[PDB]
Design a binder for this molecule. Structure first.
Ligand SMILES: COc1cc(-c2ccc(=O)[nH]n2)ccc1OC(F)F
Ligand SMILES: COc1cc(-c2ccc(=O)[nH]n2)ccc1OC(F)F
Ligand SMILES: COc1cc(-c2ccc(=O)[nH]n2)ccc1OC(F)F
Ligand SMILES: COc1cc(-c2ccc(=O)[nH]n2)ccc1OC(F)F
Ligand SMILES: [Mg+2]
Ligand SMILES: [Zn+2]
Ligand SMILES: [Zn+2]
Ligand SMILES: [Zn+2]
Lengths: 328, 328, 328, 328, 328, 328
């Protein structure tokens, strides 16, 4: 147990934003998802609360993690582990003190864990344009996201892989509904609407004297959980620069093979996916300007100002990439 | 070619509302869909307009029809053939004179043809509650409707079953989009919204001096096509009583086995599906009062008054079933 | 003063809906507008209330009437006189008891009087398509309606033609605004919006215990006056059949010469304007179904049920024309 | 061809924001509009694309420019030339890459060119209050803007002045509609609504990965073109201070004669138009604070951040004028 | 115990719509409220469910009933008893099966019981116009309704008059809130808004397969309870004609003395309150047309079709009063 | 008349935002309300415009001021005087130039003057929870606000205390309505709705060329007056820091005795009212973040940018208090 001590030391920052997931990925023999999921369940005492057999949890996590493609640069088990950990941190934000039930917390975390499982490394648009079997199956509607959900739920049926075995029938139904609602919201084509509803909610925001939010009905809470996992899924630009840059390299490394795939097919090369005409820096600045910042700014509003540091980091990272943009 | 003359004589009423599809079903050796689809394509000169190889058309129709379950009382090839023929008639309504392009007409008719293919005879709710593989796959969202589309499109890939082989790439894309949008609208859980948008469209209705509707953009036209196939799908109570009654018998015959299936499962017997406590007459009156009449009344408004007779027949049939309701 | 007694006897029905304006037209030597306007001003004591010199009133009315084309079958001084009289009757509806100020009443009546002055007998669309100087002038926007207002106001500047000479500067400004707002609303291309706002107002309708409407702000009152003159302008189908039919003959007599004009120009013959392919009866049924009935039904709602008889007459006249529709 | 070289050298900055239009005005013998319009048409290859006879173009431009009053300090051919050039630059903004068709581009530029033709040097309000023939004509509604359109279109009818002679009938119709919609939007009384719709469009803003806007329907594109020409028309405070100040001098020089005109009429002197009580500096700061900055800030958002420099210049110029405000 | 048997026989119809409350009023020595409230509490087992001391209940009911003025023709203990009984019946409608908790049922019934207590026989408007101490107190806002609530709650404080003595502190708080919300909704000036929200709720209506409504949150349920007691309060025209007519006589008998009071004050006589110019028949037809029918029609929709008979009766009674309208 | 000169010198800043009301309170022998009200009435020539007997005005002001509790740290005559003066300044904002009638101006100022009269120093919630007679009276609805109105109007009835004695009956009615509507809007529980309507009004904002707002109907104007007095009532954090801090000390000094009162009652100590656990600085930052800034930001928008300085001051004061927040 040499470096196993270093691993355990790294996992001590599970509640901190910039957790170094990449190191944990190595120190765990490529099991960041299993490791992090397990430690978060311990941390949240979910194992006890829902009577989840530890052996069952690990058996499931192992299978789930196995279904994340190793030959995929970005959408893999490290990404999954990252979104899980980020959702974990966001759930603990002060403004959301005791707002969510244990079942809702469980759903959000489980949803994060499976949100991209079995991702092939190509976009929904690619799958649609190449007339993939997956697109045929899902009628070009949230092709990947639907698939992720199917796979994640399917794996629960195997050998004591069913970590939810001891939840009441009603609880199992709720969890399935919430998980489906959250993961389907990670589809980027739903970003605008999601953000719109979030803004509508930031106004008409009901807060208790202390500072905690007041979410009465389900549709209000599920909306927050959706945007939360969405923020977690799009949190790379808000993490410490060293991490962010690694992610950017991975996502570009994945976009290019798709562009290559498209060049072979004779297809119109998707934007950013063109190896010979990419502006990595500009793309990041744009990605932040059009998607990430608008979203996080709104989130920062809702949980004001618990997200103030994250927002600041985002804006700093934008300037860094901005400066890196070639001037010629 | 003895009764083959009678069949050809029956098909002469392909443009009339009360076509006797059940007779055509027999006279064709249980090939009403293939027969009616083919005659409507001839009638509309679609074979020529889209260069569809006749042999290819029949090959596809045969396969498609084969995928409609024979042991299913209502959701089968006769129902499919009926919705196709009804859509065909509705498309020819005066108020919609030259409003739709040939591609849109093609899509609506093709959509009708595959709208319920491979239907198992149980409801989406049943599939969801019994944790079916199909519901797991489609995340309890338009489970059946999604499946119908997948199967119908999949069959096109086989042996010269691709009747669309000679459409431009752009046309193939539009047709697929429209077909998906139309079939997903046949999901009954979307009825209220669909009807709501239709009403919003009846007001603000733009008509030319002659009487023809003015549909400018796609979202306006696709909305009409959706409601149209939806009306066709829920057209039984508007057909001649002799036909309507046969349909009612079939739908109840199908509902009960589901109720039986549920009784075995130990599940709560769905309403109307309970063999020992059904009020067939009341159910029809209710079905007409809450769903069919509200929908057709609105449709009758949009195409006023081309649908006046259909509305009258509907109201007459309602009174007939009303009278039949036991008074004890 | 032989028949001058009959004329005075006819004018006794100035407050009744079916006034026989055509007879009054003859008995007055083609001065129905001057005659009816004068008698309504007397009737409403407007001459006193606004210190209008009787000689000035008649001088203006004469000039105004003179500017209505004699060679125009429908849009002439008899039509003007009719809309004036109808607005007069509508203003007296019980539901609008003391709702409007004398200035507003004056504006509505004056607006009616000039609403179609100097009408050339062709449609706005014709003027636009033929690149008329009038359309060039008004940028194809409410070409005729703008023109009517310009002419009607311009005539006031002449020889003691200024019947408003004794209104305060503020009153003159309000009257001009209201008149412009009402006449521009007679443009048929604004029918849908006008009707829409009227419906929105029928809901949220505030009525006093007795039954009188409650119109607080100007935009509410000007909206009612707009729709009122619009109803008056489209009141032919709601008058006694003998009158209605005469109007229908005149309007068709005017549409055809435009159609002839278009045939000469080599232009696409406008619908209904085609002498060799008109279905006068069908056109009326359509006109009532798509425009008149929807409007009057809404108006009948707002002033419920003071307009109940008018609505009934409208529906009876629809059936009459319906029956007259050739069955071959 | 001495200074004709300097002129050609100045025109080299036709694609740059701060083009020195005033110098070009002199170097061209007071033909900045003709010169700049011609060079922009060359630059955009519109002459070729729409088969416009060069002789016809110059003939029209000459006539158009002639109809701009020489004795009017601000609303003259230099202003027209300036709005044209600014629209030209705005059209080339990165965010609007290939968003507009050539016809739409043509419309926007042509609209800018005639947007103030035959402007008398007094406001719409003045024309209305003085009961001008123009106000009588247009019923106090966008009096000037309507007139500009009428004159600009009328001039096309003359001697090979019809630069649009080779556009299909459909194109001519679209161009006319767009031109009318754009110029009528230059009416300042429509600023609040226009800005409101623009803000509504900045949210719900659909952008492609690269950064280009996505405008699907016409009403979306015409709305952008409207606000664009409106921005161009109110672009003075955003230009280099040396230019801005010259414009401010001209506009104040024009406002005062109106104020003088009003003093003679015995009318209430309009604000800012009072020669003896004007605060030129304060007025500019106010003009920027209430109109210009709110508009440009919104525009900068829509095309973010292509307009960042323009916004900065605007804010700098505001501070300059702010400092100049007398402290006594 | 002679007629005490008849009384007990009458109370047997406590669950039926047309209960003869007037007879019960006599047979009980003018204690219809006490009698009917008690029998409804027994009927609903509320005494047990909330541990209400029977002696306490009667003590309170007696005091409450005593605070209803005997010299008031309509707004007295019989009216109170009627609204209570009607609310009781409406609560039992099939469509609202197990929708409300016992506390909510208690609140609705208690609210009905005190909804008009200590009513002086004059309108809020009268109280406002005469500068009553009550209007001064309540700032002309729901003057009477506020007063009713104050008195009804105040009486609970007396000698074992506190029938809620055994409810948890939380329950007492909820009941007070609901009661206040319901009674303040009986203010006629809030009718339009209440009806508006009810219509909005009829659309978007969520019903279970069986037919029962689905009311998730409180604001949805309290809205239904509000409209319910409002319907009960305006239920006279929906009751059997013999009853309805007696109510109409009483309400007119009360309106007139107010009209007399106003004639003495020298005040403008309120509409309908004028003894010498009333059209009792017309007033009822109007009352039904503008208030009662619109409300009940909407309610009938929400609980469709449990209220079908009530609606029919209402429409029959309208025609009766319509016919009675003098024709001279 | 020693310091009476200093007093008169202080009152010279009555039209300036940061007026030092506390000094004026001393220099006037604790009569800031009477003094400031009188000077504002002089300033606005209201005495003349409404024929208010000066002796009557002072008699009323003296009585009114007397009804503000001396033993109440915040909600007293100095607060009243402050809200009056602030409303006075806001009414004079450029953007609202001649928008309000003299009666509306009178109502707003009178409403401010009485808005908290006879305030006991405890919250509505306290009065409700302690079952106060006042809460019983007003059914827990705007308990204090209703009371303030009642007392302020009641005092007018006394000895020539009726300053409105010479207003027409109609004017008296309007003033009463507006005053009631404005004061009831000072209830903090209506803040969210009020702000919501204000935002809805900032969009769809209609402004004249010059910069002045356009408020057509009453409901629009009364809405602005409501939010105005609401802004005035919540203006402390927007005043110069020296003033703001004094107010903060007073409000906390008042909150604590309530908390003490609650500790004695054995009640749950209200937030912020707990003497032993208050974070005065944090509370202010929160108060500004959740209530004040959101409100003023919106107001600044409506009257843009007349309120720019006030907004800046608010944000500066927020940072000051933020810095003061203990870091341990
Ligand atoms: C209750 O009756 C009917 C119900 C349905 C029907 C179809 C889809 C569905 O989801 N629910 N009901 C279809 C037909 C019916 O009756 C008759 F027309 F055959
Ligand atoms: C107050 O300043 C200016 C005002 C206008 C201007 C234009 C149209 C209008 O209606 N009102 N003002 C135009 C330019 C100005 O200043 C400078 F840019 F030249
Ligand atoms: C005009 O008739 C009626 C009016 C009311 C009634 C009640 C409250 C109110 O404010 N206005 N009218 C109540 C009953 C009536 O009639 C009959 F049902 F008794
Ligand atoms: C938390 O601070 C403050 C709170 C209030 C305040 C007023 C009414 C209310 O209901 N709640 N808080 C008023 C002023 C404050 O601070 C400062 F401006 F004096
Ligand atoms: Mg202009
Ligand atoms: Zn201009
Ligand atoms: Zn009542
Ligand atoms: Zn206050």
């Amino acid at each position: 147990t040499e470096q196993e001590d270093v691993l355990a030391k790294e996992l001590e920052d599970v509640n901190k934003w910039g957790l170094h997931v990449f190191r944990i990925a190595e120190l765990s023999g490529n099991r960041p998802l299993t490791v992090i999921m397990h430690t978060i369940f311990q941390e949240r005492d979910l194992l006890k609360t829902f009577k989840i057999p530890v052996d069952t949890l690990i058996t499931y996590l192992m299978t789930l993690e196995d279904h994340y493609h190793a030959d995929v640069a970005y959408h893999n088990n490290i990404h999954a582990a990252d979104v899980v950990q980020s959702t974990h941190v966001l759930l603990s934000t002060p403004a959301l003190e005791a707002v969510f039930t244990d079942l809702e917390i469980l759903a959000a975390i489980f949803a994060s864990a499976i949100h991209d499982v079995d991702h092939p490394g190509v976009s929904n648009q690619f799958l649609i344009n190449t007339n993939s079997e997956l697109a045929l199956m899902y009628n070009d509607s949230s092709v990947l996201e639907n698939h992720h959900l199917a796979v994640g739920f399917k794996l629960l049926q195997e050998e004591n892989c069913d970590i939810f075995q001891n939840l009441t029938k009603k609880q199992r139904q709720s969890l399935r509904k919430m998980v489906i609602d959250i993961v389907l919201a990670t589809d980027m084509s739903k970003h605008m609407n999601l953000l719109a509803d979030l803004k509508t909610m930031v106004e008409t925001k009901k807060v208790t004297s202390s500072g905690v939010l007041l979410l009465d009905n389900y549709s209000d809470r599920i909306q927050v959980l959706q945007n939360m996992v969405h923020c977690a899924d799009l949190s790379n630009p808000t993490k410490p620069l060293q991490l962010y840059r690694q992610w950017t390299d991975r996502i570009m490394e994945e976009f290019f093979p798709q562009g290559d795939r498209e060049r072979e097919r004779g297809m119109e090369i998707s934007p950013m996916c063109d190896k010979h005409n990419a502006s990595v820096e500009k793309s990041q600045v744009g990605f932040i300007d059009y998607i990430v910042h608008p979203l996080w700014e709104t989130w920062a509003d809702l949980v004001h100002p618990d997200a103030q540091d994250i927002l600041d980091t985002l804006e700093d990272n934008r300037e860094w990439y901005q400066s890196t943009i070639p001037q010629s």
